[PDB]
Amino acid sequence: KSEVAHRFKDLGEENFKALVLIAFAQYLQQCPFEDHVKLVNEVTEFAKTCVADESAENCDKSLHTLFGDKLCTVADCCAKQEPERNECFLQHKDDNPNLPRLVRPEVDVMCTAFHDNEETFLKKYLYEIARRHPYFYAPELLFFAKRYKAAFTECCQAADKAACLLPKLDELRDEGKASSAKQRLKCASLQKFGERAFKAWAVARLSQRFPKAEFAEVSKLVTDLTKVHTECCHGDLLECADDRADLAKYICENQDSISSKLKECCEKPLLEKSHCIAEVENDEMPADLPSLAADFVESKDVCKNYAEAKDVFLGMFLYEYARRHPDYSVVLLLRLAKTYETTLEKCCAAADPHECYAKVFDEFKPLVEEPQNLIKQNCELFEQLGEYKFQNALLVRYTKKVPQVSTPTLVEVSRNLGKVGSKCCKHPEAKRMPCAEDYLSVVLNQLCVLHEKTPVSDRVTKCCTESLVNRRPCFSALEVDETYVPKEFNAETFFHADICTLSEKERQIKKQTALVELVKHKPKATKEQLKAVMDDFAAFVEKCCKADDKETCFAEEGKKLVAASQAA
């Protein structure tokens, strides 16, 4: 009775109001901050009436109905009945909303606003993040807000408030961007490919972390995790946070049957404990694990077990292979599981099936060696290039692959692709593949969702709609698009005095944007040709920045630059 009272009692008022604000901001990404605050306060007092009596007049209404009703007090979704209205709200979520760039003011101003009203300051942080990341993992956002508050509470009383506050604010912003991209991949998998793909992904990842866990334990954990993330990804944040807390409670109660790595994580408060559990290192795998061939290759009951109990048989195969392979990426393990299933569809319908499916594991060899080789070559290239030059190489490579994708999304995706090497190539080769290719899957989903908002490349659409687990091989196999009509140098394809004073990151992004544009001009241009154009552009900008001008050098020398670049 009174689901709103159930969530209010289970979560507590503070996490209740925070999650309601996040859900409101992710449903109405362009509603002003105080309109959302007003609605959050109204639903919060109603929840208290419902806790006061679970039989009050509207206390039996669903969370969707109540939330949609308040959201409709301030547009197509508000002319819909609730079952359709919720899905309307969810499908109007914007991965790239037309919102101002969030530039935070000087430290003095931020600390003054924080001391003026801490709870309004924290509410504003939650509101801006949720409205710019409408798929953000909401309870992790509670942990982010917690750290935000602690950062301000500590550094606003220090001598040099900037040297304290700025590093942790920057680290929080970066970690928030990474968490949002990761949860976006989870939501995209669930929404576009069904929860059976997410079961397989969770089975593989959890068998990876918890290899000592028996299959029934992993299966329960996967069921619970799937429910949590299905709820978060359908905008039911109160239930998702409640179930996330329940799952952390269960894992912490059954550590001994799960993993020996959960000791510290389970001594931490709720948000930290669940964050720690989510990012806990792989446990040691059991010592003498048997080969897989006895039950999945050499047994004469393989076809029988695959027919009579498909889901459980294949789930055991994935659990058994994943726990033995922390060195394999999750997408690779899902590829190998699909290959095993397909080989069992073909062999078990043939004349001599035993001796057909006795060679299934030989077929894993190319699928295993392709990502290993990819990661090896691109890491060594990263080792001799550095992160920035690696980003430039990947930017040219991917602009050549999909020249129709918008330049800002090409720069963003390629920069994140370059960061992949910094994150993972420093890791020892043992567990470098899973790092690299899982984080490629996240970055490529970012490309998929940003392109979904204005599809211009058939090749992006195809790789993104075809097979989740084959996304990275699909994008890797692409070469230069010969069908793209080269983009001529337009009035606004290209430079003002503001580029002289930019931060190093902004200057890098400016230059990389110019690289995308001139690759779009000559898609088949060689590295030497692009290098010459860029070195000319660099000489240009150094010339004009150092001049006695006010972007007057920029104007005429830019005319010279475009003349020299349209010919070379």
The answer to the question of residue 545 being in a domain is no
Q: Is 246 annotated as a binding residue?
A: yes
Cβ neighbors of 322 (< 8 A, separation 6 or more) are 203, 204, 205, 207, 208, 211, 328, 330, 333
Query: What distances in angstroms separate CA 151 from CA 104, 126, 140, 143, 286, one per listed residue?
Result: 15, 15, 16, 12, 41
Region at 210 (left for phi over 0; alpha for psi -120 to 50; beta for the rest)? beta
Q: Is 42 annotated as a binding residue?
A: no
**Dist. CA 18–CA 141, nearest whole Å:** 9
The verdict on 388 and 428 lying in the same domain is yes
The DSSP symbol for 68 reads: H
The answer to the question of residue 195 being in a domain is yes
Cβ neighbors of 231 (< 8 A, separation 6 or more) are 237, 239, 240, 243
329: closest CA among 425, 441, 421, 418?
441
Q: Is 10 annotated as a binding residue?
A: yes
The verdict on 383 and 469 lying in the same domain is yes
Q: Is 412 annotated as a binding residue?
A: no
Q: Are 565 and 533 in contact (CB under 8 A)?
A: yes
The verdict on 380 and 464 lying in the same domain is yes
The answer to the question of residue 517 being in a domain is no
Out of 217, 244, 279, a domain closes at 279
The answer to the question of residue 230 being in a domain is yes
The verdict on 172 and 200 lying in the same domain is no
Number of domains comprising the chain: 5
The verdict on 195 and 184 lying in the same domain is no
Q: At what angle do helices 237-253 and 3-11 cross, to 10 degrees?
A: 50
Farthest CA pair distance, the chain: 84
The verdict on 226 and 240 lying in the same domain is yes
The answer to the question of residue 146 being in a domain is yes
The answer to the question of residue 537 being in a domain is no
Q: Is 64 annotated as a binding residue?
A: yes
The verdict on 357 and 325 lying in the same domain is yes
The verdict on 313 and 340 lying in the same domain is yes
**Dist. CA 76–CA 167, nearest whole Å:** 43
493: closest CA among 532, 529, 537, 524?
537
The verdict on 296 and 262 lying in the same domain is no
Here the CATH number for the domain that contains residue 322 is: 1.10.246.10
**Dist. CA 423–CA 420, nearest whole Å:** 5
Block residue for tokens 């830019």: 558
The verdict on 115 and 160 lying in the same domain is yes
Amino acid at the residue 106: E
The answer to the question of residue 501 being in a domain is no
**Dist. CA 181–CA 443, nearest whole Å:** 7
| CB neighbourhood size of 462 (10 A) | 11
The verdict on 224 and 165 lying in the same domain is no
> Phi, psi at residue 463, to the nearest 5°?
-60, -30
**Which residues span the domain enclosing 73?**
3-92
51: closest CA among 59, 61, 39, 40?
59
- Secondary structure string (H, E, C) spanning 308-359: HCHHHHHHHHHHHHHHCCCCCCHHHHHHHHHHHHHHHHHHCCCCCHHHHHCC
Out of 311, 344, 369, a domain closes at 369
481: closest CA among 446, 455, 519?
519
Rg of the Cα trace of the chain?
26
**Dist. CA 96–CA 24, nearest whole Å:** 17
| CB neighbourhood size of 377 (10 A) | 10
The answer to the question of residue 390 being in a domain is yes
Method: X-ray
Q: Is 234 annotated as a binding residue?
A: yes
HSE-CB of 418 using CA atoms within 13 angstroms: 20
Q: Are 109 and 8 in contact (CB under 8 A)?
A: no
Tokens matching residue 445: 């989903």
Out of 140, 157, 190, a domain closes at 190
**Dist. CA 234–CA 201, nearest whole Å:** 19
The verdict on 377 and 466 lying in the same domain is yes
Resolution rounded to one decimal, in angstroms:
2.0
